């Protein structure tokens, strides 16, 4: 069948009953705010992305339980400059789903949170017992008006709006370019130059590569905003840790859009990070079983966050146990552990179907921090 892809976005392995939140808090741009830091979380969070949590420690439990009273936002430092708990930037995460558990005398808190705003770290103080605060300044977002708004002819304003986009396509975009950038003869640069800095034309060029991975992609499943599109594209690119802080340092979507277009025509073969020479997959086998793209952050029974990438095929692995259907990330499949057949490192899992006629009958899921995106 089809495997409703809204399933993995809900994180039903954590549970079903959770308190939910609606009220919102956004701080002003370029103001200084003091926000607590959640320890032991080692990951780069982008605005709009989802991060699931499972907490056990008494300091991590008493903090999140006083976030719930005040504004529900903590701070996620990238931590990935290199290491050593020193970062220059990070993202605020706001809590929206909250569940409080109990075990053999131990308090467990389950939380779902979403990334909100980027900031730059100013001061980092370890206060009281194990909770690091952070002075922070909110980085602004820049919305650039279109290039031809400055030189538009007043008598040509009426003909700006075009008829609705048709559901062939080669003709419409040429007609789109000729009319929108008509007032390019009043300047020194040709028509095709202003299309290289056009928000629409840059979002459309990236689309013509995302739908090639898995071919049930629809427009309404993908943002029409330049900002939300760029942030959501940044969160599914199988790129190194270095490039992520590079995309988070850009304050304009257009440069983020242009940068993503260059990171997409270079990375082909993903290899074992420890061996650096053994091939696991390529970019031909990537596909999206979730509404959030081919890559999302999941959580462990013990609290170990993994960002998993789904692929059709993988090679150079061997199988350890037997399929285990409990606490599966993709409902309807059982996972058996996969390890690099030459260094026995933990690469990922293999998912097999439960119902004997499902969308695929098998696929592999690979953790981000175990693969080296190399160059063939």
């Amino acid at each position: 069948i089809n495997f409703d892809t809204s399933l993995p976005t809900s994180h039903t392995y954590l549970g079903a009953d959770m308190e939910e939140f609606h009220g919102r808090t956004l701080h002003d741009d370029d103001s200084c705010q003091v926000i607590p830091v959640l320890p032991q979380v080692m990951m780069i969070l982008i605005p709009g992305q989802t991060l699931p949590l499972q907490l056990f420690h008494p300091q991590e439990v008493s903090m999140v339980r006083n976030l719930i009273q005040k504004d529900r936002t903590f701070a996620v430092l990238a931590y990935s400059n290199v290491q050593e708990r020193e970062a220059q930037f990070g993202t605020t995460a706001e809590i929206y789903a909250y569940r409080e558990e109990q075990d053999f005398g131990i308090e467990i808190v389950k939380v779902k949170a979403i990334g909100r705003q980027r900031f730059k770290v100013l001061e980092l103080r370890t206060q009281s017992d194990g909770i690091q605060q952070a002075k922070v300044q909110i980085l602004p977002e820049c919305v650039l008006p279109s290039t031809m708004s400055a030189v538009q002819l007043e008598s040509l304003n009426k003909c700006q709006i075009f008829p609705s986009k048709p559901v062939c396509s080669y003709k419409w975009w040429q007609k789109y370019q000729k009319r929108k950038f008509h007032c390019a003869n009043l300047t020194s640069w040709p028509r095709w130059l202003y299309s290289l800095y056009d928000a629409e034309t840059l979002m459309d060029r990236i689309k013509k590569q995302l739908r090639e991975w898995d071919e049930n992609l629809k427009d309404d499943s993908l943002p029409s905003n330049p900002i939300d599109f760029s942030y959501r594209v940044a969160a599914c690119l199988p790129i190194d840790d270095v490039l992520r802080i590079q995309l988070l340092k850009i304050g304009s979507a257009i440069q983020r859009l242009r940068c993503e277009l260059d990171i997409m025509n270079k990375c082909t073969s993903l290899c074992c990070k420890q061996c650096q020479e053994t091939e696991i997959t390529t970019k031909n086998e990537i596909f999206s079983l979730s509404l959030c793209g081919p890559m999302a952050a999941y959580v462990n029974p013990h609290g170990y966050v993994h960002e998993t990438l789904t692929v059709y095929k993988a090679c150079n692995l061997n199988l350890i146990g037997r399929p285990s259907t409990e606490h599966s990330w993709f409902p309807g499949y059982a996972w058996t552990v996969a390890q690099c057949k030459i260094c026995a490192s933990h690469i990922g899992w293999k998912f097999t179907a439960t119902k004997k006629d499902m969308s695929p009958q098998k696929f592999w899921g690979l953790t981000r921090s175990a693969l080296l995106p190399t160059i063939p």
């Binding site: 290039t147 030189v151 008598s155 008829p163």
Partner: protein, 816 residues
């Protein structure tokens, strides 16, 4: 850094025109708006008679005439591009002409996204309110009584967010509008009713329809007929109550009607103008149905003739029509009852010069004397030309080209000019005799490096293709001596004239990009070297490049060319070749390259200024500093070794700086902004030079010139700190004395404005306001100069006298 900005040639493009009884109840007037300049005429049998000319602190966006009940003559309502509104009245006392303001105020919402179809402003035919469409999903209404002297308005919500055009309607008891909007269904025409007491839209007098998909223009027919006329792209329709009349004129299928005017007061006739400079007449046929009723019965259109590419129109009297234009020259034409031999009903009477849009220029000296001459590339399409501005009141000369000139440069040795041009051809067949075609010698490039392996092979029917050219124009007769046609699908973005290595020859060097309709980025390019000798042109050598050559500079006997992100530096060898020397890979595309000494300035269209340096012994490039700030930037220039000047979005100017004595290396790699200014226009090219006599300059250190889209030409020169302080004091003192029209504040006009921030101007001194120091009366000068100190010691010349300052300003004016 300190600078001084003044304008040499006032803007020449026309963006609006109205007619009516403004100066007095009897005489007919013609009011013209040229960006920030307003001109008032009086129409006579012979022609136009200028009566008044005023400057406004802003770009005029809406200009209308109206007469409330109880007034002798019309009043003028104006709205600038910073949303500043006013009501102005003409007053004539003795021989003095001054425009009186009677109500003003800023109408801007604190939060809101400006619309996509621009600012729209309309007035009720009974003069009861004003309707403005600034932001999407709102409508602004201003009561129009005598008390509203601050222009207090309110907003009324709309359920349609894509209003294209809106007009008030004639012959309705309550104010009625009629607008075309677009929803996912399509384009529909609706109507509303505006209540002053309720401040909300009521139900429309007649019912909504399904108009043509490309409807764009709404015309409100006067009282006898009533209703509205909708003009689209394929049909013209009339709407009133239940009556519906539509025609499909086949002669208007070629171009798009974009402007109109009413000839007869009763709406019998209408003028129409398209993109490509054609004039139409739209007639309305009346019927009487025995019941004292006048009803429209049919519509027809006629082809009057051909004029310039028109932005505005206005019928004055007796067949005299003013054609306001932006891409060419404005005209006064006459309409004939009988067509001429060619069939035109249009006979040109006058012509008004217009230098915009200036896309390139160069400063040269054609007499070897002191005074220099400026040669620009003006106009577009069939209006393209060359303008040779000479200081002489400027004395402009025109050389028609019937093409689009792009680049210009001068070879002193060959006594010729180099021009990059482009003519539009339909699939090929030319549309008109261009300057490139009517050339003595011709040469078509032979394609050996281009096998055209990458091509769509989708040559359609009647599609438009651009053909580029290099034109050799003599410097005495200005005739075209040669024409070189570039290959198919080939652009031409850069041009330089120089000599390299140890050759005594002087060459022409051109960089091209082989664009294709499919790939969004070019992957091939060419660099070609031309030598024009004894009336013949030749291709000495060419070097194919992987990418697009965006810029070219001569770097101390070497060719510094930008190829996408690379800043590759070339060499000229004995065997007449180009050999690579250095590279510098970047994260940006280098569109703008400026050179001074050994430093190289690199920029992209998003205002990412970069600074490099050449290391001779190592033979490599190293970065010195960088400043990145996302915005739209037009052009850059190098002022000194440390300062860099550029023009950014929303018609602004900015200057950076470099600090060489910085304490650490963090601030030795950063550029500090030191100047911000709202110029008011769109700069497109910068050049070093001057038009005045060379020399024989205390407030002058370099004389950089620039040219704009509206055809305005300005001058910026560096300055000393003492004089900058002096001029800042002068401006602050003069603003209190000068009474601006519309009561606009000068600080608001010059404040650096964008969609995000608005900071006051710093580092720039406006020479236009200072030059006005001489027009004012002597008591005004005394008031401005009173309590001021200006000298070198001796009590600062005691109380600084007015005579010292008037001499100072005269010396300042001497630079242009």
């Amino acid at each position: 850094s300190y600078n001084y900005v003044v304008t040499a040639q006032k803007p020449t493009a026309v963006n609006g025109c109205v007619t009516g009884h403004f100066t007095s109840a009897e005489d007919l007037n013609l009011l013209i708006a040229k960006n920030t300049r307003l001109e008032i005429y009086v129409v006579t049998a012979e022609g136009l008679r200028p009566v008044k000319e005023v400057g406004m602190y802003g770009k005029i966006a809406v200009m209308e005439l109206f007469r409330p009940k109880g007034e002798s003559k019309d009043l003028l309502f104006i709205l600038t591009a910073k949303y500043n509104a006013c009501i102005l009245e003409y007053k004539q006392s003795g021989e003095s002409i001054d425009i009186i303001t009677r109500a003003h105020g800023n109408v801007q919402d604190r939060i809101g996204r400006p619309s996509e179809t621009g600012i729209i402003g309309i007035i009720d035919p009974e003069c009861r309110m004003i309707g403005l469409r600034l932001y999407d999903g709102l409508f602004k209404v201003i009561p129009l009584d005598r008390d509203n002297k601050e222009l207090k308005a309110f907003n009324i919500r709309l359920e349609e967010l894509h209003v294209i055009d809106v007009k008030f309607l004639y012959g309705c008891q309550a104010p009625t509008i009629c607008f075309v909007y677009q929803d996912p269904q399509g384009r529909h025409v609706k109507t509303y009713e505006v209540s002053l007491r309720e401040k909300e839209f009521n139900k429309g007098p007649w019912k909504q329809e399904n108009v043509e998909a490309e409807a764009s223009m709404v015309i409100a027919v006067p009282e006898p007929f009533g209703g509205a006329i909708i003009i689209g792209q394929e049909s013209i329709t009339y709407h009133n109550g239940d009556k519906y009349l539509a025609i499909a004129p086949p002669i208007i299928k070629q171009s798009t009607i974009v402007c109109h005017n009413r000839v007869d007061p009763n709406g019998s006739r209408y003028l129409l103008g398209d993109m490509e400079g054609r004039l139409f007449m739209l007639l309305l046929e009346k019927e009487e149905q025995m019941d004292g009723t006048v009803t429209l019965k049919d519509l027809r259109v006629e082809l009057l003739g051909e004029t310039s590419i028109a932005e505005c129109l206005t019928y004055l009297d007796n067949g005299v029509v003013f054609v306001g234009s932006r891409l060419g020259d404005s005209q006064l034409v006459k309409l004939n009852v009988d067509s001429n031999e060619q069939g035109s009903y249009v006979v040109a009477m006058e012509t008004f010069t217009n230098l915009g849009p200036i896309v390139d220029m160069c400063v040269v000296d054609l007499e070897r004397q002191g005074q220099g001459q400026l040669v620009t590339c003006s106009g577009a399409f069939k209006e393209g030309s060359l303008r040779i501005i000479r200081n002489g009141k400027l004395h402009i000369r025109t050389v028609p080209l019937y093409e689009s000139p792009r680049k210009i440069c001068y070879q002193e040795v060959s006594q010729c000019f180099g021009v990059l041009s482009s003519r539009i051809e339909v699939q090929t067949t030319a549309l008109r005799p261009s300057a490139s075609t009517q050339a003595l010698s011709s040469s078509v490039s032979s394609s050996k490096l281009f096998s055209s392996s990458t091509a769509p092979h989708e040559t359609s029917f009647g599609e438009e293709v651009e053909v580029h050219n290099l034109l050799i124009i003599d410097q005495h007769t200005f005739e075209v001596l040669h024409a070189h046609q570039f290959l198919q699908n080939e652009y031409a973005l850069s041009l330089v004239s120089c000599k390299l290595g140890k050759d005594p020859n002087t060459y022409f060097i051109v960089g091209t990009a082989m664009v294709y309709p499919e790939e969004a980025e070019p992957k091939q390019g060419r660099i070609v070297v031309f030598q024009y000798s004894d009336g013949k042109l030749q291709t000495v050598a060419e070097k194919e490049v992987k990418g697009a050559v965006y810029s070219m500079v001569e770097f101390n006997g070497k060719l510094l060319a930008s190829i996408n992100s690379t800043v590759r530096l070339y060499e000229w060898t004995t065997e007449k070749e180009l050999r690579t020397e250095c590279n510098h890979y970047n994260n940006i595309m280098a569109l703008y390259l400026k050179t001074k000494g050994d430093f190289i300035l690199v920029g992209d269209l998003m205002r990412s200024v970069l600074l490099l340096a050449y290391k001779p012994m190592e033979g490599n490039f190293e970065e010195i500093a960088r400043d990145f700030n996302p915005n739209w930037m037009s052009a850059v220039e190098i002022l000194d070794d440390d300062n860099f000047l550029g023009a950014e979005n929303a018609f602004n100017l900015f200057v950076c700086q470099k600090d060489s004595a910085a304490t650490t290396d963090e601030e030795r790699q950063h550029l500090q902004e030191v100047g911000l200014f709202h110029l008011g226009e769109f700069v497109n090219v910068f050049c070093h030079g001057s038009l005045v006599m060379q020399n024989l300059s205390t407030p002058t250190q370099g004389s950089v010139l620039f040219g704009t889209v509206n055809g305005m030409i300005g001058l910026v020169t560096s300055l000393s700190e003492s004089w900058y302080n002096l001029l800042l004091d002068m401006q602050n003192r003069l603003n209190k004395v000068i009474k601006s029209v519309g009561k606009i504040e000068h600080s608001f006009w010059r404040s650096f404005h964008t969609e995000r921030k608005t900071e006051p101007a710093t580092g720039f001194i406006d020479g236009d306001l200072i030059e006005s120091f001489l027009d004012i009366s002597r008591p005004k000068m005394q008031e401005v100069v009173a309590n001021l100190q200006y000298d070198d010691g001796s009590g600062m010349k005691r109380e600084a006298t007015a005579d010292d300052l008037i001499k100072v300003v005269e010396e300042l004016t001497r630079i242009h």
